[PDB]
Amino acid sequence: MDWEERENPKRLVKTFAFPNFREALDFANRVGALAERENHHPRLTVEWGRVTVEWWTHSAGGVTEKDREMARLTDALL
């Protein structure tokens, strides 16, 4: 579904689920490679069975068009 919109700070959030820890870390690495390609970085939370990806522009204190674009590119990884 659509990315969640959390607050303080405003940011786009989505969780991706996995059967273990290694696959979650592997996916986080794909998101990280995407971040490096686009030069816009997320906050990633990796744990057994899940990766939480959060997109927001730090220098802006909130969400910008780039964040929405990164969210879409993250979905396109699958």
* Closer residue to a second copy, CB minimum distance, 4 or 36: 36
Closest contact distance (angstroms) between CB of 49 and a second copy is 9
Q: Which residues contact a second copy (rule: CB under 8 A)?
A: 21-22, 25, 28-29, 32, 35-36, 41-48, 58
Closest contact distance (angstroms) between CB of 54 and a second copy is 9
Q: How far is CA 62 from CA 32, 56, 68, in A?
A: 20, 5, 11
Q: How many whole angstroms separate alpha carbon 22 and alpha carbon 3?
A: 24
C-alpha closest to that of 11 among 77, 75, 76, 66? 66
Closest contact distance (angstroms) between CB of 21 and a second copy is 5
